[PDB]
Amino acid sequence: PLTRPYLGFRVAVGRDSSGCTTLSIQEVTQTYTGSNGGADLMGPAFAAGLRVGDQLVRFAGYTVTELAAFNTVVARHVRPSASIPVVFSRDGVVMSATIVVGELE
Secondary structure (H helix, E strand, O other): OOOOOOOOOOEEEEOOOOOOOEEEEOOOOOOOOOOOOOOOOOOHHHHHOOOEOEEEOOOOOOOOOOHHHHHHHHHHHOOOOEEEEEEEEOOOOOEEEEEEEOOOO
């Protein structure tokens, strides 16, 4: 699957307590859809607990490029009942949680 180059969130480049160069999310990006799903809203995101506050890198090392880099990953990850492990950080914290996103129930 794949989606168009659309960004529905904010990303700020900074440094955490650890210092791995990561971008924190201020808005919601798990509430949008259009590829292999078509249903931008809030529902499946809350199932995993994806909300504003935590940062998403989805990369080994607790580091990320920017919204542009996440735009491709998200689109590629976008699938019907597709759940995969994501790496998030909390102000320099290391934690991993599985999030299941449903694009086509």
